[PDB]
Design an enzyme around this catalytic site. Structure first.
Site, PDB file in Angstrom:
ATOM      1  N   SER A  19      31.629  35.159  38.724  1.00  0.00           N
ATOM      2  CA  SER A  19      32.720  34.747  39.604  1.00  0.00           C
ATOM      3  C   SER A  19      32.277  33.980  40.842  1.00  0.00           C
ATOM      4  O   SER A  19      33.152  33.493  41.571  1.00  0.00           O
ATOM      5  CB  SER A  19      33.557  35.945  40.061  1.00  0.00           C
ATOM      6  OG  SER A  19      34.414  36.382  39.029  1.00  0.00           O
ATOM      7  N   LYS A  47      33.871  30.619  41.289  1.00  0.00           N
ATOM      8  CA  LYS A  47      35.214  30.444  41.828  1.00  0.00           C
ATOM      9  C   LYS A  47      35.196  29.667  43.143  1.00  0.00           C
ATOM     10  O   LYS A  47      36.164  28.968  43.464  1.00  0.00           O
ATOM     11  CB  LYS A  47      35.883  31.811  42.014  1.00  0.00           C
ATOM     12  CG  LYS A  47      36.343  32.470  40.702  1.00  0.00           C
ATOM     13  CD  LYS A  47      36.675  33.947  40.928  1.00  0.00           C
ATOM     14  CE  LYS A  47      37.429  34.544  39.749  1.00  0.00           C
ATOM     15  NZ  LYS A  47      36.540  34.664  38.588  1.00  0.00           N
ATOM     16  N   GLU A 107      37.348  31.589  32.129  1.00  0.00           N
ATOM     17  CA  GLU A 107      37.378  33.047  32.086  1.00  0.00           C
ATOM     18  C   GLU A 107      38.070  33.511  30.805  1.00  0.00           C
ATOM     19  O   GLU A 107      39.095  32.946  30.420  1.00  0.00           O
ATOM     20  CB  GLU A 107      38.129  33.605  33.299  1.00  0.00           C
ATOM     21  CG  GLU A 107      37.449  33.332  34.633  1.00  0.00           C
ATOM     22  CD  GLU A 107      36.284  34.268  34.882  1.00  0.00           C
ATOM     23  OE1 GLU A 107      35.643  34.143  35.941  1.00  0.00           O
ATOM     24  OE2 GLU A 107      36.029  35.153  34.032  1.00  0.00           O
ATOM     25  N   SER A 164      39.075  38.000  43.150  1.00  0.00           N
ATOM     26  CA  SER A 164      38.334  37.633  41.938  1.00  0.00           C
ATOM     27  C   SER A 164      39.264  37.614  40.723  1.00  0.00           C
ATOM     28  O   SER A 164      38.892  38.013  39.617  1.00  0.00           O
ATOM     29  CB  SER A 164      37.127  38.552  41.724  1.00  0.00           C
ATOM     30  OG  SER A 164      36.072  37.863  41.054  1.00  0.00           O
ATOM     31  N   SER A 204      30.078  39.318  38.968  1.00  0.00           N
ATOM     32  CA  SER A 204      29.512  40.328  38.091  1.00  0.00           C
ATOM     33  C   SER A 204      29.833  39.968  36.649  1.00  0.00           C
ATOM     34  O   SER A 204      30.870  39.366  36.366  1.00  0.00           O
ATOM     35  CB  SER A 204      30.035  41.729  38.422  1.00  0.00           C
ATOM     36  OG  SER A 204      31.439  41.795  38.297  1.00  0.00           O
TER      37      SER A 204
END
Length: 263
Positions: free
Chosen positions: A45, A48, A141, A105, A212
């Site tokens: 992440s 992002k 994702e 997230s 993560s």
């Protein structure tokens, strides 16, 4: 050319069982501390930040872009999207999606940012345009989190990410209002207290984005404002040999503490 700080980071890494990557930029004097600074790590992440920044760059020539609504359909919902799931069968603005992706997230929100940029390659194209030749986003994702060792997809190096995070938050890769907005979002992150922040003096102000993924991959990228001195940029990437390894945010806190001892 091995410094005391690098030897301590090596000792941390040896005890951790995993592979650690660190890049510090001290903007007071532009000096750097690197540990495996040119090895690739899965971003998870932390990517992002690049997607939100790419939309902020788009908004420099579209004054209402951040208020543009984006439809959220039930089929769009990907694991860990606590904000987007409240808006299913409705809409979120690009500002709302950026804030949700950065501060919670939210995975679905990230996928909407990627789509607004024309796909993962549009995020990579933005990275190249701001001088980052290393970042690559290849998937959406949730598959961008597979974090398979040796796999170049969805990776960067600590050195590159630190330099890019500096240019985005403290330099002039973005317009001033957009840079301020990115900083505001990062400072409002909800997910960072156990990672880089946990290794720094509590009086210092931090904006960060965690990551993560599989292989116990545990990441954090941060801009740091210590009391009474110029800011720092710090990235800490960590990944482990077993696909099902558990998160190790404490190892990022330990890396940050070693870095802070060296200042």
């Amino acid at each position: 050319q091995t410094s005391a700080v690098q030897q301590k980071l090596a000792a941390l890494e040896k005890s951790s069982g995993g592979r650690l990557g660190v890049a510090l930029i001290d903007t007071a004097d532009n000096t750097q501390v690197l540990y495996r600074g040119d090895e690739r790590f899965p971003m998870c992440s932390t990517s992002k930040v690049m997607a939100a920044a790419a939309v902020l760059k788009q908004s420099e020539t579209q004054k209402q872009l951040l208020n543009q609504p984006v439809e959220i359909k039930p089929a769009d919902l990907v694991n860990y999207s606590p904000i987007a799931e409240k808006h299913v069968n409705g809409t979120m603005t690009l500002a709302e999606l950026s804030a949700a992706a950065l501060q919670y997230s939210d995975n679905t929100a990230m996928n909407k940012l990627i789509a607004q940029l024309g796909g993962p390659g549009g995020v990579t194209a933005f990275a190249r345009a701001i001088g980052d030749e290393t970042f690559r986003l290849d998937r959406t994702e949730p598959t961008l989190n597979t974090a398979i060792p040796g796999d170049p997809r969805d990776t960067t190096t600590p050195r590159a990410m630190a330099q890019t995070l500096r240019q985005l938050t403290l330099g002039h890769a973005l317009g001033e209002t957009q840079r301020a907005q990115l900083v505001t979002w990062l400072k409002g992150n909800t997910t960072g207290a156990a990672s880089i922040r946990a290794g720094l003096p509590t009086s210092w102000t931090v904006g960060d984005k965690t990551g993560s993924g599989d292989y116990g991959t545990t990441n954090d990228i941060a801009v740091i404002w210590p009391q009474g001195r110029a800011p720092l940029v710090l990235v800490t990437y960590f990944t482990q040999p077993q696909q099902n390894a558990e998160s190790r945010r404490d190892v990022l806190a330990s890396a940050a503490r070693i870095i802070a001892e060296g200042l």
